[PDB]
Each structure stands twice: as C-alpha cells, then as structure tokens.
Amino acid sequence: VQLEPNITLVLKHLASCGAVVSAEQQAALDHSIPIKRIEAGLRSLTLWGRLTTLNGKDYLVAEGYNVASSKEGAAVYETKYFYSQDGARWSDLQPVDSETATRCARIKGMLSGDPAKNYELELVFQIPELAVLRCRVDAIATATSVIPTDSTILNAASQVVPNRLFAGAAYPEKLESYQHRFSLPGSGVTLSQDLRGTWAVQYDAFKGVAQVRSLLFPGYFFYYAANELTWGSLYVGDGLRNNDLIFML
Amino acid sequence: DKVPPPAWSPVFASASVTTRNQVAGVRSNRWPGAVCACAGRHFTSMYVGWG
Amino acid sequence: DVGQALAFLQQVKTTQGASIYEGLKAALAKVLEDRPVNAVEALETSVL
Amino acid sequence: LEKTFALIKPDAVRAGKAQEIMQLIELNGFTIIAKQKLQLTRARAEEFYGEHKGKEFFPKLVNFMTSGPIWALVLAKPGAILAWRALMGPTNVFKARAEQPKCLRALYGTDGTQNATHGSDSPISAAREIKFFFPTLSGDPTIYAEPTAAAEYITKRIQPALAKALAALAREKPSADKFEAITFVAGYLLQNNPNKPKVLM
Amino acid sequence: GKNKVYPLELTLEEIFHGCLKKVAHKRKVLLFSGEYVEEERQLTVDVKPGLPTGTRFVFEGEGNKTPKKEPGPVVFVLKPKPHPRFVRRGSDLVHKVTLPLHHALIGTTLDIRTLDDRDLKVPISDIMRPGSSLTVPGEGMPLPATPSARGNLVIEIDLLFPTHLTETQKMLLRSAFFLPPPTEQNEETKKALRDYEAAFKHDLKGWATVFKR
Amino acid sequence: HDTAYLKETVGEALARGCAAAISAQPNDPVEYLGLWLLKYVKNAEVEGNFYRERQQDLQKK
Amino acid sequence: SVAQALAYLQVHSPQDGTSMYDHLVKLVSKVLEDQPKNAVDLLETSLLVKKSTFDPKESSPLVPIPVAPDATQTQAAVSIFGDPELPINPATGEPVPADPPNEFEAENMLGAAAVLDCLGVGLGRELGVNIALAAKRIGEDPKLAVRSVR
Amino acid sequence: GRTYCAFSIQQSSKLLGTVVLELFTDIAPATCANFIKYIKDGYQGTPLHRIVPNGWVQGGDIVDGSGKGDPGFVLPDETYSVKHDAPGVLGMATGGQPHTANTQFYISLSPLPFLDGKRVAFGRVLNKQSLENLLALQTLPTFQNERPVPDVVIASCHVIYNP
Questions:
Q1: What is the dihedral sign for C-alpha E202, E207, E209, E210?
Q2: How far does the signal peptide extend, from start to end residue (chain F)?
C-alpha cells in the first residue's frame, strides 16, 4: 500500500518502546530531510535510527537509496547512510573495507561524541570512530531489516518495487508474515527461518497493530498497523550485540 | 579505549547553547534507560527500558 | 494482409484459455480504464 | 492523428508559468507524447535556428534562446499543428493583445521576440524538429516505409560501407558458423565507417 | 605522410556525461590558380563517458588534397578545459581545498559539488596531517572500459594556519594540548573545566556563538 | 559459390537490421547497424538463460 | 475517443525507453513471425520482448539539467535551528569580526506553546518551537537592536 | 571428439609405415564429409604424387593417379580458419583460383606461413609416429623431379572413432 514509511507515524507508534527523538530535533527533521533528499540523488530517504553516545549528541542516522535490483539470488539496495548530531545539517558515512571491517567488530563499548575519535588495537592500529559507527549500522541492518512479506515484487529488468496491490499479511502475530528486506520476493525465507528465540512479536488484536522486537539486538523495534497498512522500523540505543542470548532466554 | 567510561552522561534538549528555556538532565550508563531531568524547581527521575 | 493477420490471431489460444486477440483487447481495455502510474511496467506487473 | 513540436521559452520559465502552460495545453485537448527540460548551448541554438540564417533578428534571438532552460514538448492531436497554431495566436504579442486577448502571447508574452512559446510551422519542419530534439522518438511510418525511399536510403547511406564489409568477409572467409561471421562484419562496420572516426588512446 | 592535428577542448562535465560534439574542418584543395580554394566540412565526433585525456580521433580521407596524392587523415586530440574545482588525474578527480587549522583539529564537513548535479558533505575523520589527503570512493570520472564503475574523489588538504595568536590564546592552546587524561584529572581540575565550559558556553555573555558584524 | 556462403551466413539477419535501421532513421546508420548486430548476437543466449532460470525456479517451488 | 486512447498509448515513458504502442507493435510482430502452433504465454512473450528490445544508447549533445523545486524557503527555515559557525577570512585564516547576541526581554515561549496546546488553541508545539527559534533569531540580532520580542 | 582416419604407406612390396589423422569435423564439416566419403570409396591405391623435401606430401588423384584433374565433382572453398603453422596439417589442394578443389590433398611437413588464406586445411596428424613416417618418407632413395622413382602406393585406409 504505502511507498515509504513516514517519519511522524514511526515516531508515534514506537514512542511507547522508548524510540523517541528530541522535540527540537523533531522540528529540524521535518525541514532538513527533504533538503538532503534533493541535495543528493536519492528518491527515498528516511530516518534509520538514533545511536546513543557518551555525550548528549546522539548520532541520527538516515538511510536512502536510488536503485534496488536483484543479483545473485538476493535483493540488494544501494543504500547511502548519513549521520548528524542534530537534525539541521547531515554529513555522509563512507563505506569501509574488509580489513577494517574485521578490526572494527572487536571495539566493544559506547561511541564518543566527536566523530574525529580514533581507537587503538593490536604494533598499533588506528581506526576512526566513523568507521566503527558505519560497521555497527551495517551489522544491525544485516540482521534486523524487517519488512512485511510480499510487500515487494519483481518487475521487468529484475528490479524489486513496492507491491501497489498489497492487501496486508494474514496472522500478523506470526513471524511468518515478516521477511528480511534483502530476501527475494519469490523465496519463502522469513523471520521464522532465523533462530527461534531471536525475535519476539506482541500483536494487539483489537487495534490491529503488531510490534516486533529483536532480542539479539535489543535496540531495534518494528511496527505494522494492519488496519491502515503502514509499517516502519527504527533503532535506538547503542549498536552492540547480545552475544549470550542462551542465558537470557 | 583504556579510559573507563563514566556511569552518568549529560543529556540536552537543544543544539544551541543560547536557548532561553532549555531542559537538561543526566542519563545512567550502568542502567540503560534511567534518566533524570531538571528545569528550575521541577526535577524528575524515570526508568524506562529493559531491566 | 491485415485481415490474414487478424484471422491468424483469432485462432491461436493461450495458457489462460482465451485467444491472443481477446486477451490483448482485454488487457488494453483494462489499461485504458485504470490509467496506471507506470503503464509499461504495469502491463507486465498488474494487468496480466 | 498527428504530432507537432513546441517549446516553452525561458521567458515563460523564469516566472514559473511552465506548469500553468502545460495545464492549459492538457485542458485544450492536447497530449504530451514527450517533455524535457533542457538548456541549449550557442552552437546547438544556432543549428536549431538554421532556417533564419543571416537574418537581422538572429543575434538577439540566439542570445535570448540561451539565457535559460526551455521545455521541449511533443503534442499529439488529429489536428495538432493547426490547433496549436490557433492556440498560439499571432506572432506579435502587441498585435495578439488587440486581436485575441485570451492567447498565450497576450497572457505570457512580453515582447516581439519574447512570445514565451515557440511551435512548429509545417509537418516537415515538425518532423525534423522532433527528430532533432528526441532522436529516439519513433514516428512517420509512411514516408520512410516506402519501397523507392528505402531503396534510395540503402543505396546512398548503408551500401557504401556494407559492400566493403561483405567484400572483406568474402576475402577472409571465416568459420561457416553464423555467429563468428556476424561478429566479424559488425566489428568491421563499427571499426571503419565513413561518418564516424577511429578512436585511439 | 603528413597529418593535421587539432586540439579539441572539452569540459569536465562533457567528459563525465558523454558529449556529441560537431566540429568544423577547413579543407584546402590545390588547383591551377596561384591561390588555394578551401571549403568547410562538418564532422561529428562522439566522445564516450570518461575517455582518457589525449584520446586521438582520426578521420581518414579528410585533409588538404594535393593534385597527386590522396589527402591524409586528420587527427583530433582530446584535452580538458580548466575547471574551477576539479582537475582530473587519470580516472579520478582531484580537489584541492584550503582548510582551517581548527577545522582540521576539531573536525568539520567539507562541502563539494560534484560534476554530476549532486552536493556532497564529507566529514573530517581524524586530525588532518600536513600534506595529507582524503578519499571518497565512487565519486570520480567513470571508467572508460565499464560504464558503471567510477574512480574515487581525492581531496588534497592544504592547511590554513591562523596568522596571529594572543598570549592568552597560546596559554589556552597549551592547556588543551597538555590536559591530563580524564582518569588522571584532579577534582579541582574537573571543577575548573566545568566552570570554564559553562562560562564559555554562557547563553548571553559567552563567546561560544556570536553574530558577525 | 561465394554468394551462397554470404547468403546462408549473413544474409538473414542483415535484412532485419536494415529494416530496423530504415524504420528508426538514426543519425549514423552504419554505426546503428553494428550495434544492432551486437545486440542480435547477444540476445540469443540470454533468452535461453531466462528460460533456464524460469524452469529452475518452478522446479525449486 | 479513439484518438485520445491512441495518443495516451503513444505517450513516451522516459525511464523505460518505450511506449505502449511500440511495445504492442513489437509483441504482435514477434507473434506473427513465430506463427506458434502450440499455446502461447502473454507474460513470457512480454518479458522476452522487453529483454530483447534493442536500445541504442548514443550520446546527447546537451548535458542533462536537473528538475527540482526551489529550496530557498526551506533553507532559510533550517538556518534558524543551529547557531551558525562564524566564518573566517581566507586571507588571514582568523574569524571575521562579530558581535555578541543582543540582550532582549521575551517570555517563556516554549511554556506558552505548552499552555496553548494544553488548552486546545494556538498553532501547535511543532510550530511553537519554530516560533521560539525565530524570535531568538530576531532578538539576538545586534544590528536590529530590540528591547522586547513578542 | 572428432572423427579419425588411418592409412598405410607402402613402397615396392615393402611396408613403409602407417599414419593416423584427426578430422576437424567442427570446423569444415562439408570438407570432412567429402574426405570421409572418398576415403570410404576411393584412395585405394592412389600413388603419392608430389613430395617436396621441406614442403608438403601431396597426392590423392582418383581417375588418373598421375596429377591431372578429375571430372564429376568440384568442391567449393569452405573456410579459412586453420592456420598452417605446425607440421602435419592436412588440407585440400585446388587450382590457381578458388572453387576448383578436388580429391587432391596434401599434408604439411613444415610451418607454412604463406599458405594461409589460399588452401583449405581441415585436419591434423595425431601422434609423433605418423609425422616421423612422413619425415622418413622425405628421404627416399631415388625420386625423380618431385615424384618417387618407385610407386609409393596407399596400401590400405579406414575410418575410426566416429560413424
């Protein structure tokens, strides 16, 4: 039904789960989001999430893309990520190479405020904080990107496009009604094929709103209102991973 | 890093330090989701999140 | 000529069970009435 | 059903009346086959205005045509050319205001050269301009698809290179399979042809 | 075996996008008259996106025609016109920006308008060394071989150091450059730092933000 | 003789290419024809590739 | 009627590079060339034609220009949120001469917006934040020396 | 995965050797088919006509067997793809102009840069023994004006590895 999740609806439905933004930052978001969508070539830019930090200047992260094709049996989005301490001015997040991608997963802890911070590892390796910031966003999006099933379909030239005739998913409480965004529409891969205890779903049968929370990544929330057929997701908190999931459950 | 993080971190309500009436507070790092806010004579503490 | 092509098209059937002429006519009528956003993509995506 | 070429000049653009012009065009029964916002350079404008070469108004016309982006549009209607000219109105804005006040020249034009719009005149010029600005836009399947016209085109455009390519293929005599010979002749045609040069680096 | 070589100046935008230039050639044919007679020929050259500098386009059979020998080919050598922002170095662009010292240290976002009609805001990831550089992948000239991949935009940083510094400014710089680690700071040190930060970011009488006159 | 070789080697597709060129009326018919022949030799394998992919997908389902 | 339908079908789609009329002509031509004795598949034929259409992508004499709505108003609206950094003179590298914010007397506009929202009147909290920021911009101007902003 | 054909060389009631050839049935199918048909019905006793020391071993005439052209068929030129660059390359010989080819065949005994583009080559030797047989045949005791003084005659021939 919808073609792009809203910023007001996501911030409204996820307010209960603590996924909220500063009131001043909310006002700046309404103005500077369309500006960044035109300065860059992106045609669909939304707010991916907000990562906390040792200071009060949380990293507001926005994700946008132009083309979304299907190659090697997996739908790939040429996503572009932007970061901003406040909602006024956005900067860009460059991708990182494989050698740094392995040396950034060992830096556990909480990110600092100034994006010009360098961490040290072992000879000494100097890694910028923005590289660490990009790694955590990529790791979270790899395992948590959740969209309703059959919401995207394949057309000619192998492009995944929104299903304009989507009629919603029956039994929204079941995990089989949601799939990863990079899963091909034909493939029957859903959140059920993941680890059994990773995802928990709380569905309000009366108001027709469902909430999906990741236990592997506790800061990720996704909602899906069946009545109005709107879905959106956001991430709050740090981007660390819950390694010892077996003990928690 | 070799510097242990502090247990509490500041939280602001505006990106400008010249706002006339801006609320400010602290946020606990040991227990995530615990916040304290203060504006003049009105102070409050609240814990929302996972225990 | 054109009549030969029309007569040929009225004989060949299709997996859906109708002739190519009737199927294309129905698809064109559906496209004309609906007026989709992207007509060319909608031909292969929705109306067929 | 015919089609004609028409462009919205930069004078009708800088004030943002292009959307209103398109809405009026749609309200008057026309249909936009293709539209494109684009800015001409000096050489492109001079080539486009080739008919009025060496005229007294040519310098000011070409200077004005490249002062801002225009909109290029193709309009389709059974009586497209004459209907577009009637909606166009008189060639002079001052005369248009007196004659038909409810015409695009009176509503948006401000000067004899700044009539805010330009249109085709004759079907041949319209086809030429449509080919000039939209090379990939198909059309005119009757004048081009004629036996004598096709023979004349083949004789004087593709034959001089095709004969040499086929002679080279006959001399070389590659493998009897279709694909290798087709690839060889296509490579020769794209390698040495009269109009295009050879690229070296 | 002589050939006429002509420069062909193209802008960086034309090279990036792929232009279709029409050039005029003055061909001279020798006749019995004492003076020559010449004609103007129109040649269409199709430059592909991101062709390397120095590309030669040769038109065979076009050139001055002596009565006996067939005229030799004419050569067009592709060169780029100067650009206010970017100078190309092979397959990727190079941008030279003058950077403030405090920008280099604290960290700011350089603003670059690409050859394509897109803005770009590239943050400073660390303390920019003197003579160092920054790289933004996938923001340069497209590869001549493949029409999808591009080079990487290179920002060459030339620091702009402040001209004058007062004694109190130097004292503050020394304090900032020799501040102890936060695990070693005294309670008095922390209190003084908090007081100074509050006084510097004072909303009405602080100099954290000011309006230009 | 050699005309038979030419006719049953390049004769069939050349007529279709010439018809496409005269229908399109491009600016460089000689350049248009060559790219047309490259596309003509390219699409023959990809149509079978598409058939194979569709059959494999149906079998997997 | 029929002319309108024909024009609508001949409307050229920019991104796809072809029109309904051209696609239908190509499909019917391919069917006529095939002369299929067995059953056909409209979806299969349409996809195969779409993948087999020749698309000559030649260069264009003019560099593309972008179409985009004006952003001056939105940029001005954004410029009030964050305090602008003081620009420096490139010749000297030092910040340009500036003035401190002007001292003015205004009420608690955020509290006023909260009270209005509680009562059920006013302009809303989202606009109240913008109004407060704009009032701060007006008051802090040293050239526009004001004593009170309301 | 081509067709193979073997034949024996014998001079004056004395067996000189045997040779085996592979036919490029995927390069020159018509020439290969004609060569197989003639080796099935023909080449049974045709003497080796022309023997160049550092050139080629030539022969294979049917109706005359001494170097004149034969009637009843003319083989058109098929394709110039195999390049004469290594010894033991089998091809057909034609007149001074194309589309006059006959049963007359030749086997190269040395790299032949000049012969490409003029003679249709559609076969090759298999092993070193077959090439050494021709190399030894080069140094016959007496051969008069590029023809062996005795009758070097094809003793037998057959086809293998492919119907």
A1: positive
A2: none
- Which residues form the domain of H8? 1-163
Q: What are phi and psi of E153, to 5 degrees?
A: -70, 130
Starting at the edge strand that comes first in sequence, how are the strands of the sheet with D198-200 ordered?
D198-200, E56-59, E74-80, E4-10
Tokens found for residue H83:
């390049």
Tell me how far apart the terminal alpha carbons of chain D are, to the nearest angstrom.
49
CA D35 to CA D17: how far, in whole Å? 15
Number of other residues whose CB lies within 10 A of the CB of residue G24: 17
Rounded to a whole number, what is the distance in Å from the CA of E21 to chain D's nearest CA? 10
User: How many whole angstroms separate alpha carbon B46 and alpha carbon B44?
Assistant: 7
G135 Cβ partners below 8 Å, 6+ apart?
A: G106, G109, G149
CB neighbourhood size of H9 (10 A): 21
- Would you call B45 an interface residue with chain G, using a CB distance cutoff of 8 Å? no
Q: Where are the beta strands (DSSP E) in B1-51?
A: 8-11, 24-28, 34-39, 42-47
Altogether, the residues listed in chain H come to a count of 163
Residue H7 tokens read as 């034949």
Q: Please tell me whether residue H141 adopts helix, strand or coil conformation.
A: coil
Rg (CA), chain E: 29
Which of D169, D172, D175, D180 has the highest number of chain H CBs within 10 A, making it the mutation to test binding with H? D175
Task: Mutate one of A107, A110, A125 to test the B interface: name it (highest B CB count within 10 A).
Answer: A110
Q: Which chains does chain H touch, 3 or more C-beta pairs < 8 A?
A: D, F
Instruction: Specify which residues D71 forms β-bridges with.
Output: D8, D37
Q: How far apart are CA A239 and CA A220, in angstroms?
A: 9
Give the C-alpha separation, D154 to F21, whole Å: 10
d(CA D74, CA D126): 9
- Please tell me the distance in Å from G2's CA to the nearest CA on chain A: 29
- Give the Cα separation of G144 and G149 in Å (integer): 11
Could you tell me if G134 and G91 are in contact, meaning their C-beta atoms sit under 8 angstroms apart? no
Helices vs strands, H then E, count in chain G: 6, 1
- Structure resolution in Å? 3.1
Q: Which residues of D are less than 8 Å from H78 in CB distance?
A: 173, 176
Tokens of E101: 């010292």
In three-state form (DSSP H/G/I as H, E/B as E, the rest C), the secondary structure along chain C is CHHHHHHHHCCCCECCCCCHHHHHHHHHHHHHHHCCCCHHHHHHHCCC
CA-to-CA distance for E125 and A129, rounded, in angstroms? 8
How many A×B Cβ pairs under 8 Å?
A: 33
For chain H, the domain total comes to: 1
User: Is residue E97 within 8 Å of residue E29, measured between CB atoms?
Assistant: no
φ and ψ of A221, to 5 deg = -130, 140
A10: Cα separation from own chain's centroid: 12
Residues forming beta bridges with residue A79, ordered by sequence position: A65
Contacts of G44 in chain F (CB under 8 A): 54
CA F2 to centroid of chain Cα atoms: 23
| Min Cα–Cα distance to chain G from C33, Å | 10
CA G16/CA G7 separation, integer angstroms: 17
Helix axes G42-52, C20-34, angle to 10 degrees: 70
Distance CA D14, CA G79 (A): 26
Token pair of H20 as six digits? 């085996």
- Percentages helix, strand, coil for chain D, rounded to the nearest 5? 50, 15, 35
Residue F48, CA distances (Å) to F16, G28, G32 in order: 21, 21, 20
